[PDB]
Amino acid sequence: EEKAQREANKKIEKQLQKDKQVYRATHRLLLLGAGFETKFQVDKVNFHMFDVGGQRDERRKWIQCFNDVTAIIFVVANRLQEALNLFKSIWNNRWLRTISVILFLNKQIEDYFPEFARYTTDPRVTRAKYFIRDEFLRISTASGDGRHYCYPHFTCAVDTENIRRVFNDCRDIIQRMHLRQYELL
Amino acid sequence: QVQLQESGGGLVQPGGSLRLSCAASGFTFSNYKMNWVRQAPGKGLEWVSDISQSGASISYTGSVKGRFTISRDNAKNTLYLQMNSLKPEDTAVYYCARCPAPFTRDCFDVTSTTYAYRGQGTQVTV
Amino acid sequence: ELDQLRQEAEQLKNQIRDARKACADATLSQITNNIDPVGRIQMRTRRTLRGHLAKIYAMHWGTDSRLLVSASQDGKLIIWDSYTTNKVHAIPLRSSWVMTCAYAPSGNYVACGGLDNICSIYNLKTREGNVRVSRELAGHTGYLSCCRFLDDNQIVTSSGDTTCALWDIETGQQTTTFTGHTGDVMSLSLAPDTRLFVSGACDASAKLWDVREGMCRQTFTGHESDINAICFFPNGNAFATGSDDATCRLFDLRADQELMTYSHDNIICGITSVSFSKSGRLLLAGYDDFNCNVWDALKADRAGVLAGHDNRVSCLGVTDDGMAVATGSWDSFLKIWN
Amino acid sequence: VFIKPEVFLSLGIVSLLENILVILAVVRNGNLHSPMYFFLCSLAVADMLVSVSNALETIMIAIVHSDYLTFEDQFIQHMDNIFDSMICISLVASICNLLAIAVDRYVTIFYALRYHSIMTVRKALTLIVAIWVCCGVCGVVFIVYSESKMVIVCLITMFFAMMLLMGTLYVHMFLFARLHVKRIAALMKGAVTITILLGVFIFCWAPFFLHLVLIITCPTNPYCICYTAHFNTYLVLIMCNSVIDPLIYAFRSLELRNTF
Amino acid sequence: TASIAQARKLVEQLKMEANIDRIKVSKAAADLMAYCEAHAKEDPLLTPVPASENPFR
Amino acid sequence: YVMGHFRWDRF
Ligand SMILES: [Ca+2]
Numbered sequence: 001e002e003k004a005q006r007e008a009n010k011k012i013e014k015q016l017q018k019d020k021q022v023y024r025a026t027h028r029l030l031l032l033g034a035g036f037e038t039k040f041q042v043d044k045v046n047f048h049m050f051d052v053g054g055q056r057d058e059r060r061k062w063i064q065c066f067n068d069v070t071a072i073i074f075v076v077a078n079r080l081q082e083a084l085n086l087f088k089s090i091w092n093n094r095w096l097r098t099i100s101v102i103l104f105l106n107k108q109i110e111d112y113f114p115e116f117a118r119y120t121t122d123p124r125v126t127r128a129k130y131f132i133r134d135e136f137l138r139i140s141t142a143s144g145d146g147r148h149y150c151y152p153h154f155t156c157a158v159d160t161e162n163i164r165r166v167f168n169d170c171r172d173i174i175q176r177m178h179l180r181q182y183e184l185l
Numbered sequence: 186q187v188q189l190q191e192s193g194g195g196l197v198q199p200g201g202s203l204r205l206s207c208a209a210s211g212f213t214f215s216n217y218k219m220n221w222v223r224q225a226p227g228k229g230l231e232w233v234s235d236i237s238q239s240g241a242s243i244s245y246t247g248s249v250k251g252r253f254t255i256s257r258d259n260a261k262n263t264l265y266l267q268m269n270s271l272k273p274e275d276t277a278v279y280y281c282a283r284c285p286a287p288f289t290r291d292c293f294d295v296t297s298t299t300y301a302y303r304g305q306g307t308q309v310t311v
Numbered sequence: 312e313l314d315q316l317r318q319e320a321e322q323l324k325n326q327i328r329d330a331r332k333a334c335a336d337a338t339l340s341q342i343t344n345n346i347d348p349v350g351r352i353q354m355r356t357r358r359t360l361r362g363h364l365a366k367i368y369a370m371h372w373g374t375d376s377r378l379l380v381s382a383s384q385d386g387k388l389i390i391w392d393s394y395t396t397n398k399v400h401a402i403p404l405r406s407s408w409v410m411t412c413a414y415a416p417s418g419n420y421v422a423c424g425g426l427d428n429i430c431s432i433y434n435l436k437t438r439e440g441n442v443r444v445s446r447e448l449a450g451h452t453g454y455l456s457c458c459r460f461l462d463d464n465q466i467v468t469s470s471g472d473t474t475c476a477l478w479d480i481e482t483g484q485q486t487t488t489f490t491g492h493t494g495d496v497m498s499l500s501l502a503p504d505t506r507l508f509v510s511g512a513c514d515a516s517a518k519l520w521d522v523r524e525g526m527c528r529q530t531f532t533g534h535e536s537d538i539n540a541i542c543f544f545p546n547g548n549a550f551a552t553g554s555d556d557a558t559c560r561l562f563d564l565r566a567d568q569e570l571m572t573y574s575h576d577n578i579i580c581g582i583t584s585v586s587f588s589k590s591g592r593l594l595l596a597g598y599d600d601f602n603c604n605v606w607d608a609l610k611a612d613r614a615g616v617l618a619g620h621d622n623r624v625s626c627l628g629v630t631d632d633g634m635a636v637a638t639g640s641w642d643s644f645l646k647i648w649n
Numbered sequence: 650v651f652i653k654p655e656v657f658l659s660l661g662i663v664s665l666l667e668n669i670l671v672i673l674a675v676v677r678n679g680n681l682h683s684p685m686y687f688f689l690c691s692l693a694v695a696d697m698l699v700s701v702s703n704a705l706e707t708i709m710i711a712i713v714h715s716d717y718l719t720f721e722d723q724f725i726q727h728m729d730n731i732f733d734s735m736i737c738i739s740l741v742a743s744i745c746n747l748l749a750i751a752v753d754r755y756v757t758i759f760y761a762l763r764y765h766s767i768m769t770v771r772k773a774l775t776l777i778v779a780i781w782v783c784c785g786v787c788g789v790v791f792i793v794y795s796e797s798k799m800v801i802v803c804l805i806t807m808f809f810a811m812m813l814l815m816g817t818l819y820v821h822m823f824l825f826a827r828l829h830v831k832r833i834a835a836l837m838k839g840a841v842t843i844t845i846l847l848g849v850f851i852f853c854w855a856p857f858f859l860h861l862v863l864i865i866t867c868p869t870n871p872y873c874i875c876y877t878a879h880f881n882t883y884l885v886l887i888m889c890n891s892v893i894d895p896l897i898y899a900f901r902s903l904e905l906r907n908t909f
Numbered sequence: 910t911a912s913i914a915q916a917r918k919l920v921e922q923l924k925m926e927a928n929i930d931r932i933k934v935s936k937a938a939a940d941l942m943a944y945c946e947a948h949a950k951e952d953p954l955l956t957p958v959p960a961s962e963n964p965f966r
Numbered sequence: 967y968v969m970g971h972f973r974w975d976r977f
Contacts, residue, residue: 017682020682021765021769024765025765025766027762044763045762045763045766137836141836149833167762170762171761171762172829174761174762175758175761175825175829176829178754178757178758178761179758179822179825179826179829181903182754182758182822182842183838183839183842183901184822184823184826184838184839184842184843185826185829185830185838185839
């Protein structure tokens with residue numbers, strides 16, 4: 001019976017070594033913030049995107065099972081301060097402390113943000129856009145230690161070019177991780 | 186049993202001044218970051234301020250920056266909020282929340298509909 | 312209106328607190344003061360099981376103390392023979408976010424669930440020799456945190472929508488619902504007689520439920536943060552909890568209050584799993600600082616360390632004959648200590 | 650023109666211990682089935698072979714130089730032939746592994762998304778064994794065939810090509826890091842790393858092949874050819890390179906460094 | 910009436926939980942100590958078994 | 967026959 005058990009273990013191991021090849025060659029993304037799985041492929045590399053819309057409003061327990069994801073896609077349009085606070089709590093989490101964030105500013109003013117009166121970049125809309133981007137970047141570039149970064153973008157159209165952007169930032173994420181592991185960055 | 190009981194408040198004329206108080210019991214006050222949260226009549230919960238474990242780090246929302254002051258007393262297990270230069274918009278119910286876990290830098294789910302580590306609230310009218 | 316009900320609730324809480332205090336005749340520390348200490352419990356890794364690609368969230372021993380199941384977040388369910396480290400089955404799951412797994416006391420079934428809000432039952436003893444799904448249970452509106460078989464036809468599942476439920480696997484329909492919590496329910500533990508169970512949630516409280524009538528009998532409030540783990544004493548008259556404040560506590564059902572606390576000033580990380588030894592003399596507890604600790608349950612003195620993992624320890628179990636301990640971790644390795 | 654044989658025993662033991670620790674940290678840990686560490690294991694094996702072969706030969710000369718002679722001429726020739734074949738095989742294997750590591754790093758950085766699909770375990774192992782076999786054949790041929798021939802020209806051209814390739818790959822990698830660094834600062838450690846790799850490689854390997862160049866072009870000319878008289882300390886640099894390659898390649902890995 | 914049903918249910922549950930019989934802590938501690946002492950010789954982790962009887966050698 | 971530390975010490 002030991003021969004049969006050894007044979008069964010052999011079959012299991014052969015299948016596991018084949019599944020590991022598919023698992024490691026795929027990039028998993030989380031799409032919290034706003035708008036379940038979706039498998040899409042761009043330039044012969046497969047991406048796996050998850051959206052977690054079916055849960056309750058308490059995030060601190062099921063968010064820590066996404067600690068090995070390659071990047072977090074955060075879509076953000078006082079509704080702004082709530083998004084800022086959510087970003088600040090995600091950034092400083094103990095388990096999501098090495099995850100990069102791809103930020104999509106989907107909108108494309110001094111009463112709620114009084115620091116705008118002294119901020120210098122119609123040029124008024126560009127000033128507003130860069131103010132919001134600078135708020136998010138001022139949160140991100142304060143407690144990084146060099147293990148994760150933020151990649152903000154402006155998105156307002158029919159989103160014909162929103163898939164190449166995620167491709168480009170997911171390439172930069174891995175390039176920076178490897179360059180930092182080789183003591184070169 | 187973690188209990189947070191807020192006191193103070195009432196009705197004030199515009200330009201008035203109040204001082205909300207929050208007495209804490211059932212946990213070690215020093216290891217947690219505390220916050221203030223409000224709910225205007227007709228809308229959802231809005232974050233107002235927070236303070237670190239020692240009082241070094243302090244943050245405010247934009248609308249109340251410059252005219253609200255938060256401070257904590259670790260020996261007396263109390264949390265204070267100083268409200269001067271009141272405006273008619275500031276009428277709401279003020280809650281005294283708390284970070285879910287000690288020693289962490291992140292407060293999660295403080296402004297949720299059903300959060301288990303915040304008090305019952307005191308009504309402030311202007 | 313609401314003020315009168317709140318005042319009555321405050322008065323009732325005061326009455327319950329006074330009744331509990333009147334029974335504090337002594338403390339557990341004073342009674343067990345003249346008892347010889349256990350000594351130094353040194354354990355050594357026997358086996359290390361390597362088949363998982365991603366982190367491990369759950370494990371559970373079979374009733375014969377030889378086979379165990381483990382669940383990892385790559386979407387795989389593996390059944391091991393702990394004696395020879397061989398693999399018996401490897402089941403792929405439809406959802407990759409699996410947070411719990413269970414082993415039927417008869418050994419014929421296996422369950423799992425997670426962020427897809429569904430409990431799936433797998434038939435191991437197939438007529439054709441191939442493991443295929445048997446039933447999917449869909450009645451929860453939040454992620455599944457724990458599940459435990461009562462027999463081959465009943466299962467109790469706790470979920471992140473603040474509820475527990477008792478299911479009927481044959482018809483796939485809920486039998487009763489236990490609605491008293493105010494946060495995500497994180498764990499549960501069946502009594503040895505399977506007539507009661509306890510559950511701990513994210514409101515820093517634990518409750519004792521009655522399966523047959525579906526009511527809550529007692530509520531225990533000693534912790535300060537979310538409760539992650541819970542376990543029953545061997546005789547079924549006490550239970551132990553572990554929370555995010557880096558403390559474990561022992562509660563007694565008959566005294567209806569807390570007896571002992573297991574804390575040290577060097578430990579500032581939450582507990583992820585607890586378990587008991589066969590006689591109830593030792594208390595095993597896994598931590599976020601990557602190692603487990605052994606406590607003297609009668610004297611609250613640390614008596615050992617199990618340091619062999621490279622990441623957070625997520626699961627922990629002791630066999631029914633008490634001959635080994637299995638600990639999984641986020642580095643995807645199970646280890647068996649002895 | 651001569652050094653004490655004590656160094657050829659002090660270097661070999663240290664190199665063997667370092668490389669065996671490196672091998673232990675990989676064939677036992679979970680750092681397995683990943684192509685990155687198979688190349689490090691191959692490099693450790695090649696450097697251990699270099700040190701073992703040199704130490705065994707050194708004690709061979711130590712025993713038989715004037716007294717306790719075993720046989721007159723035949724046995725010494727038949728033994729030193731295989732000893733030098735082993736040394737040559739280990740040299741070429743070490744150089745090839747050093748270049749394979751650099752090519753692997755280049756592929757990881759400059760594809761980074763199609764990787765793990767173009768460098769699987771099967772391909773990594775089938776090229777590791779191919780390198781080892783194709784280097785063993787050349788090492789045996791360069792000795793058990795006409796040494797007093799045009800073998801030396803090949804033996805230097807391979808080294809020059811390997812040096813140029815290593816320099817090009819690592820310089821390109823360093824320049825790419827800096828653009829990223831800039832893109833960030835607008836919101837050196839790399840130079841030190843590149844220098845420590847390339848300079849150690851060159852300063853430990855180049856003198857021997859320069860000597861090989863200078864023994865077929867200017868035998869009698871004394872215009873800086875007395876250089877070709879320190880031949881015995883040009884082999885000490887190879888041992889010292891063997892004792893550095895594990896300290897700057899595998900001990901820099903955070904996981905391996907934490908394991909031991 | 911939105912938050913007055915929860916208060917009513919909480920009051921009912923507290924009333925139901927306020928009337929149960931309790932024993933002194935001394936009795937419970939003595940029972941736990943007795944159970945722990947009466948099964949000390951059947952705990953392999955507390956009293957390691959010889960290598961002959963250990964299936965994980 | 968003179969033993970050499972390694973081959974090619976000269977030509
Ligand atoms: Ca020779």
